[PDB]
Design a protein around this ligand. Sequence first.
Ligand code: HEM
Ligand SMILES: CC(=O)[C@H]1CC[C@H]2[C@@H]3CCC4=CC(=O)CC[C@]4(C)[C@H]3CC[C@]12C
Length: 466
Amino acid sequence: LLSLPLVGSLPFLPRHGHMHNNFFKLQKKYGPIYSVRMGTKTTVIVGHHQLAKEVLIKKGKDFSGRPQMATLDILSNNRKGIAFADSGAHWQLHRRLAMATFALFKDGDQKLEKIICQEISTLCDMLATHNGQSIDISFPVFVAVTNVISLICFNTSYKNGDPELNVIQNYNEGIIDNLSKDSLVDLVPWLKIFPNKTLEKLKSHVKIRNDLLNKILENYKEKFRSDSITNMLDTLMQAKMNSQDSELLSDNHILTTIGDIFGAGVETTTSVVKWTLAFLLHNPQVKKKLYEEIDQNVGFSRTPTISDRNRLLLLEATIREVLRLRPVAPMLIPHKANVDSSIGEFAVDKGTEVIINLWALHHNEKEWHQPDQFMPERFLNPAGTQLISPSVSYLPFGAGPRSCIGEILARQELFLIMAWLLQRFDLEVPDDGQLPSLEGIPKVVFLIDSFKVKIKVRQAWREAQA
Ligand code: HEM
Ligand SMILES: CC(=O)[C@H]1CC[C@H]2[C@@H]3CCC4=CC(=O)CC[C@]4(C)[C@H]3CC[C@]12C
């Protein structure tokens, strides 16, 4: 009796469980590195830190490419910008100019910390009006960090009530939902198989956003002067008139770059805040210690500041643990091999998509103790007097040529938002008992479901205004 001809095989069910976890589970069978092939395209999936650091760092320039996706073509305006641009002149030029801009905010009246604390103070104010109510803090936060990024890009911010923020949130939500059903890593290229309106939807959202950007671009071409270089949009225009590069800095090129900066800045950081609050509602004991800690080292004589990250250690560990358990990009962004190269002595041909399963790196049992648990203690020494790095299998922000450019902005924004929130507010479970689900919704960003927090102004903050 004969066996059936097999026209295709896949190692697990599509749309069943989270991709990053499904790949992780296969390592029991196949090893920390393996490949899958769809049609003519081969994809490799790496899930151990050693091989990862080889793809990211050691042979970084070999694997610094981005694969083309129908859905990303639209968002990045045909692989422009930074995040979704192939490695090349365009990419390298803009990446450095972006990174350069963060130097203009290292001191002065535009010290990044001052720009941040300003919008947080607007934030805490707004929230305080909801004293004794249960609310979704997504949009109050979205607004705060949008303002920070807008100040970095244009030296401007939005006024409270401005409906442009709403327009932005709508297309932000729409781009994310249509960018991919789930993770960016798709096994089967569904959208090319069945009739669907996925691309039409994404175009019409991204059109709105590109309109809004182009509008800002025009109403800044007049306000620009080489005598004043203070923000990201200045930096890009400075470098354009000095030009071989006149093509690499067209309108569409600066548009799309500002695009990635705006998106990355707001969505990643707002997601992580939410994940942070969510975890603390599940773990009161930790929350108590964070309250206890903040009262000892900052009290109520003043508002928190960067310099406090040197003493508010448990808060720092907490943020570190949230980024461990729930990475923003559980599988980073997909990489590509620019040349023929190797990983763990295995040949990898030019054009091969390479995927780093960061989920596997943060949940590896040999590297972490009880990795499935939320234990910020893991990032502190046994006394709790300094921070540690208990594993090298940890890469929230990536590494090497395509690593995160806004890590420093992000780490600060997060630290300040929580510290302020913790100083001023009692954050509790809403009256009907519902906690949020820490299962999460993997899209291009690892989101959490909407949820509510009952929010009260702490007595100790009130009884210290007299
Ligand atoms: C907690 C917050 C954040 C996390 C965990 C994070 C993490 C990451 C990761 C994993 C990547 C891709 C790594 C790779 O492809 O190898 C990335 C890329 C990038 N991130 Fe972030 N990020 C965060 C916040 C931000 C912020 C605040 C900005 C502000 C501008 C930003 C801008 C970018 C850009 C432009 C890239 C593309 C890099 C490239 O293609 O060369 N991100 N980030
Ligand atoms: C963490 C990360 O990789 C960042 C780098 C580029 C960022 C994205 C590119 C710009 C962008 C625009 C949007 O309208 C939704 C948010 C997105 C889709 C951004 C979400 C987070 C990304 C994917």
